[PDB]
Amino acid sequence: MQQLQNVIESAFERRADITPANVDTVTREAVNQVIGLLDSGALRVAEKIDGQWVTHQWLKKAVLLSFRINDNKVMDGAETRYYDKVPMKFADYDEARFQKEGFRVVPPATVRQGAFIARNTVLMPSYVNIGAYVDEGTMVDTWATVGSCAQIGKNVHLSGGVGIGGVLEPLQANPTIIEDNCFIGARSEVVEGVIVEEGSVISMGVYLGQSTRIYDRETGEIHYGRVPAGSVVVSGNLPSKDGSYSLYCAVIVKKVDAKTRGKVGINELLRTID
Amino acid sequence: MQQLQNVIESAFERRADITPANVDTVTREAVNQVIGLLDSGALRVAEKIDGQWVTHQWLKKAVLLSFRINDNKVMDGAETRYYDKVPMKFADYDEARFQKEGFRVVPPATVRQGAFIARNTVLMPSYVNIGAYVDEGTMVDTWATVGSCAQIGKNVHLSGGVGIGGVLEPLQANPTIIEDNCFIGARSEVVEGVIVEEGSVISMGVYLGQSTRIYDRETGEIHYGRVPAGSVVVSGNLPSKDGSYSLYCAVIVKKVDAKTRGKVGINELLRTID
Amino acid sequence: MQQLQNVIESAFERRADITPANVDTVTREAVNQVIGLLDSGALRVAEKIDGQWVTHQWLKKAVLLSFRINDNKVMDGAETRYYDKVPMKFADYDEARFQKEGFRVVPPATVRQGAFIARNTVLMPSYVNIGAYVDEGTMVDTWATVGSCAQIGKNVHLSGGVGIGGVLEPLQANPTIIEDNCFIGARSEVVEGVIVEEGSVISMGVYLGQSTRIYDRETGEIHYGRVPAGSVVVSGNLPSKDGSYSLYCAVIVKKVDAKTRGKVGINELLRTID
Numbered sequence: 001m002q003q004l005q006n007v008i009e010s011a012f013e014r015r016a017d018i019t020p021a022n023v024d025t026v027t028r029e030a031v032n033q034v035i036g037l038l039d040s041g042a043l044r045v046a047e048k049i050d051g052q053w054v055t056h057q058w059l060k061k062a063v064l065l066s067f068r069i070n071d072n073k074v075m076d077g078a079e080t081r082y083y084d085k086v087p088m089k090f091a092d093y094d095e096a097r098f099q100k101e102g103f104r105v106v107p108p109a110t111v112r113q114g115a116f117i118a119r120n121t122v123l124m125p126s127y128v129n130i131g132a133y134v135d136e137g138t139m140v141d142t143w144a145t146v147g148s149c150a151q152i153g154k155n156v157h158l159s160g161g162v163g164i165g166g167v168l169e170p171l172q173a174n175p176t177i178i179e180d181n182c183f184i185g186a187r188s189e190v191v192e193g194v195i196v197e198e199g200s201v202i203s204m205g206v207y208l209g210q211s212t213r214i215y216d217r218e219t220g221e222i223h224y225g226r227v228p229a230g231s232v233v234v235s236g237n238l239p240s241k242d243g244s245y246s247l248y249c250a251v252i253v254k255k256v257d258a259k260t261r262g263k264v265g266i267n268e269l270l271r272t273i274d
Numbered sequence: 275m276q277q278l279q280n281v282i283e284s285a286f287e288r289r290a291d292i293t294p295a296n297v298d299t300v301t302r303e304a305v306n307q308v309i310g311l312l313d314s315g316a317l318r319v320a321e322k323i324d325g326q327w328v329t330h331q332w333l334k335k336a337v338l339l340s341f342r343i344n345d346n347k348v349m350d351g352a353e354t355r356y357y358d359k360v361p362m363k364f365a366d367y368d369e370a371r372f373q374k375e376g377f378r379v380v381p382p383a384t385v386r387q388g389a390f391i392a393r394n395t396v397l398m399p400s401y402v403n404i405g406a407y408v409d410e411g412t413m414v415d416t417w418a419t420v421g422s423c424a425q426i427g428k429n430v431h432l433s434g435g436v437g438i439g440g441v442l443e444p445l446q447a448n449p450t451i452i453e454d455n456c457f458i459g460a461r462s463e464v465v466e467g468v469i470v471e472e473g474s475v476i477s478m479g480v481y482l483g484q485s486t487r488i489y490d491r492e493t494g495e496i497h498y499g500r501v502p503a504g505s506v507v508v509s510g511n512l513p514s515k516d517g518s519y520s521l522y523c524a525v526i527v528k529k530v531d532a533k534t535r536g537k538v539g540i541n542e543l544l545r546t547i548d
Numbered sequence: 549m550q551q552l553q554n555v556i557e558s559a560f561e562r563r564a565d566i567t568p569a570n571v572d573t574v575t576r577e578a579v580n581q582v583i584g585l586l587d588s589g590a591l592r593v594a595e596k597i598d599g600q601w602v603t604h605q606w607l608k609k610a611v612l613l614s615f616r617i618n619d620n621k622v623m624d625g626a627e628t629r630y631y632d633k634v635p636m637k638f639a640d641y642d643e644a645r646f647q648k649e650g651f652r653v654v655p656p657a658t659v660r661q662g663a664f665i666a667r668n669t670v671l672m673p674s675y676v677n678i679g680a681y682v683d684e685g686t687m688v689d690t691w692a693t694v695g696s697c698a699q700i701g702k703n704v705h706l707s708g709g710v711g712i713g714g715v716l717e718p719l720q721a722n723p724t725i726i727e728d729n730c731f732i733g734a735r736s737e738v739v740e741g742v743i744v745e746e747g748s749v750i751s752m753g754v755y756l757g758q759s760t761r762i763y764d765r766e767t768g769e770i771h772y773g774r775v776p777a778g779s780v781v782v783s784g785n786l787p788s789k790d791g792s793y794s795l796y797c798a799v800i801v802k803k804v805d806a807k808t809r810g811k812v813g814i815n816e817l818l819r820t821i822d
């Protein structure tokens with residue numbers, strides 16, 4: 001990986017001057033290799049280590065560079081045409097590979113090459129962008145989007161119309177991360193490297209970014225950037241000092257319980273069979 | 275229907291042990307028949323009877339079982355491939371059938387087999403899941419989603435990015451129902467068997483589930499699970515006891531009037547011609 | 549343009565009696581010409597003149613008439629079929645034209661014919677409807693929608709799941725307009741001819757329509773229908789007179805600054821190369 005990491009970090013510095021025509025064979029083959037590993041799950045943009053999520057910036061750099069080294073090509077849709085430079089992950093798969101890989105892909109769900117999809121996941125019509133990692137047993141419901149380099153844990157349920165922030169535009173320092181066993185309610189959005197800790201339940205229409213106050217009504221504590229494991233979060237507002245208006249905020253109303261669990265469970269019958 | 279209802283309710287009990295390989299010819303043919311009837315409108319998951327919506331649980335059971343009896347197959351997209359077990363409703367249609375059926379399907383709108391689409395409807399790019407029923411003159415605007423088994427009335431307008439809850443995952447007791455002549459504003463969501471009574475207008479960004487308080491500012495009455503016919507609903511918040519924060523709620527601000535009607539009308543010129 | 553404007557305004561009056569069969573060759577060829585010009589950018593539905601946006605109603609009329617003069621046709625998807633009357637903009641393009649045109653179209657992004665897409669734009673999977681105009685350097689992120697006749701400025705960033713109001717259904721007087729250099733946050737919606745003035749930043753989950761109060765906490769001034777240039781807008785609520793509840797509103801919390809700019813920048817490396 002040093003043999004790759006090196007070439008990669010070298011080119012990034014020259015990013016604005018590289019183009020699909022002036023790029024040297026070395027750098028091209030390397031970025032190519034790195035994208036192929038992300039696509040495999042062999043490498044991943046962010047990892048939890050010693051109980052801390054860490055970002056491998058050189059891997060974000062390679063994702064970025066792929067856009068400088070590759071040229072667009074016409075892609076043939078059936079009733080229309082496309083012109084883009086990132087290949088479709090599943091375009092070369094056959095039943096054997098799909099069977100071997102063990103996930104379900106509902107038309108017209110789409111995934112870019114360079115994204116990792118784990119066994120036993122179900123992708124309803126949705127989008128998974130380059131460099132993302134989607135772990136085992138997770139469902140990505142209709143019109144949801146897993147942003148560039150985003151990290152989705154095992155057994156997570158991303159409801160309909162949910163958006164998980166990328167790192168490409170706007171440019172971001174760290175990917176967005178949703179830990180294991182979380183449920184993200186319909187039309188909610190999690191962006192800007194916010195971390196939703198495991199086993200948490202985010203309600204519908206909840207918008208979390210670095211400037212969002214996650215208010216714990218119990219303790220009076222206000223969080224920023226992260227949702228403490230096992231929380232149930234809903235939309236609310238906090239009043240101005242004069243009380244003349246109030247602004248949006250996320251409110252932790254309680255810890256997940258049986259009652260909550262009743263409404264957010266994963267349906268095993270929909271998962272992979274034997 | 276007893277000849278079908280019977281086999282169906284028998285297998286459901288053995289749901290976890292059935293698989294596409296061990297399933298007996300009988301049960302397979304039956305589930306198959308039942309799905310074909312839902313697809314026709316001949317049967318429907320929930321029906322209003324004596325002015326009460328009622329759920330036919332055995333029909334929800336068959337929808338569920340279809341996922342145990344059928345195996346995935348590679349579906350050929352143009353630029354990509356899919357692997358799933360529910361056929362595409364329109365894959366076998368020709369102009370004659372489309373002409374005869376009388377609705378409009380805008381690419382890349384997609385509908386699963388087992389869903390009923392009525393005459394004179396317009397599907398912008400969106401998703402309609404198995405077992406759903408969409409009645410006459412309704413428009414499903416861009417990126418909207420009609421969840422599994424959901425019931426949509428006649429002349430309804432589901433705006434852009436609207437989501438109507440399914441019953442598959444999370445698993446639900448009753449489907450979500452939107453009665454006739456309702457207008458659901460952009461990016462709103464209605465889930466968990468909530469019922470929106472006829473002629474109601476839901477504003478943009480309104481999220482309704484069983485735990486959502488639908489507050490009538492006029493009467494002071496708080497509803498749960500249903501929107502009284504002819505209401506105009508918008509987002510709001512209710513203050514904590516200490517007044518230190520407030521939480522999301524839906525507010526009935528008034529009864530539909532000419533003024534309202536001015537903003538939510540169906541455009542007949544877009545509907546079917548002669 | 550008078551030779552077209554004339555025929556157009558004549559037919560519109562007879563809109564309900566025209567059909568794909570009874571329509572005269574003249575009116576057909578004209579509507580056809582007018583749609584071809586909108587598609588080219590040669591004509592546009594709304595234009596800023598003397599620092600005021602103005603709507604060319606006759607052009608909205610032609611868009612409307614196209615739905616009366618054209619008949620549906622089966623469109624062949626790969627795994628499914630469609631039945632509609634507005635052709636796909638890119639169906640006839642080849643690499644040369646795409647290269648010449650200079651924008652990027654990510655599968656399965658879709659655009660109707662009669663919509664203008666400018667050089668150096670990037671369309672992630674999304675929808676651009678007939679008569680819309682999307683200016684230079686703009687990005688339309690995943691699942692966003694540019695409504696019928698909507699006007700999007702240069703270098704604008706429409707985030708994921710964003711919806712920009714159309715004028716077809718419900719029927720609208722004026723198109724929705726987003727001026728140059730604006731950033732519209734994830735899952736927000738701008739409809740009903742509201743105008744977002746240049747260089748403004750709309751946060752996530754902000755819903756703006758004619759009845760939305762845009763409250764300036766600094767001045768105490770409440771706007772309706774427009775976002776003053778350079779504002780940063782977020783969701784909030786305003787309290788009832790009795791203080792027994794509060795209702796949704798948009799709050800201008802500040803003027804764009806370096807801090808803001810840090811979170812909303814366009815990524816030039818993603819744009820067109822040389």
Ligand SMILES: CC(C)(COP(=O)(O)OP(=O)(O)OC[C@H]1O[C@@H](n2cnc3c(N)ncnc32)[C@H](O)[C@@H]1OP(=O)(O)O)[C@@H](O)C(=O)NCCC(=O)NCCNC(=O)CCC(=O)O
Nearest residue numbers: 142159160185186203204253259260419437439440465485
């Ligand atoms: C978060 C919930 C699970 C509710 O938590 P719960 O049921 O365990 O707890 P409750 O006791 O009901 O609520 C605790 C407090 O929170 C408040 N609360 C809970 N949920 C709330 C909500 N959504 N809005 C406002 N307040 C809420 C309660 O009013 C209560 O108030 P208080 O404690 O002060 O008296 C629920 O609100 C929710 O968000 N469910 C998820 C909905 C969802 O996303 N469903 C997916 C849609 N299904 C589909 O198939 C869609 C398909 C598609 O769109 O494509």
Ligand SMILES: CC(C)(COP(=O)(O)OP(=O)(O)OC[C@H]1O[C@@H](n2cnc3c(N)ncnc32)[C@H](O)[C@@H]1OP(=O)(O)O)[C@@H](O)C(=O)NCCC(=O)NCCNC(=O)CCC(=O)O
Nearest residue numbers: 416433434459460477478527533534693711713714739759
């Ligand atoms: C609900 C409305 C129709 C407004 O109701 P109305 O116009 O009949 O009533 P009003 O008199 O304006 O409002 C009554 C009260 O409700 C409040 N109110 C109304 N609408 C409100 C809103 N959206 N937000 C907050 N308050 C609102 C008013 O401020 C007023 O306050 P009060 O009475 O206390 O003084 C409107 O707000 C609305 O939601 N319209 C629907 C918007 C929509 O979904 N459009 C579809 C978008 N069009 C497209 O083409 C999108 C395309 C795509 O996304 O793909």
Ligand SMILES: CC(C)(COP(=O)(O)OP(=O)(O)OC[C@H]1O[C@@H](n2cnc3c(N)ncnc32)[C@H](O)[C@@H]1OP(=O)(O)O)[C@@H](O)C(=O)NCCC(=O)NCCNC(=O)CCC(=O)O
Nearest residue numbers: 145163165166191211690707708733734751752801807808
């Ligand atoms: C508007 C912001 C940029 C924040 O403005 P800022 O960072 O310049 O200013 P701040 O100093 O943080 O905020 C000023 C005031 O507004 C409040 N505020 C700011 N943003 C807020 C928000 N989102 N919610 C609530 N309050 C907010 C602050 O709390 C602060 O309060 P006060 O001044 O009274 O003390 C941010 O909130 C925001 O909306 N960012 C855009 C998020 C977004 O849409 N990202 C796109 C997602 N990225 C992807 O890749 C998605 C992919 C996909 O979905 O497909």
Ligand SMILES: N[C@@H](CCCCC(=O)O)C(=O)O
Nearest residue numbers: 147148166167168169170818
């Ligand atoms: N907000 C998105 C934009 C992706 C752009 C991808 C492309 O240009 O191909 C993200 O950061 O992931």
Ligand SMILES: N[C@@H](CCCCC(=O)O)C(=O)O
Nearest residue numbers: 270421422440441442443444
């Ligand atoms: N929330 C959605 C999930 C559908 C899953 C369909 C599938 O697995 O094929 C619903 O209940 O309708």
Ligand SMILES: N[C@@H](CCCCC(=O)O)C(=O)O
Nearest residue numbers: 544695696714715716717718
């Ligand atoms: N709300 C949308 C509906 C578009 C309908 C287009 C069609 O019928 O083909 C708009 O006004 O743009």
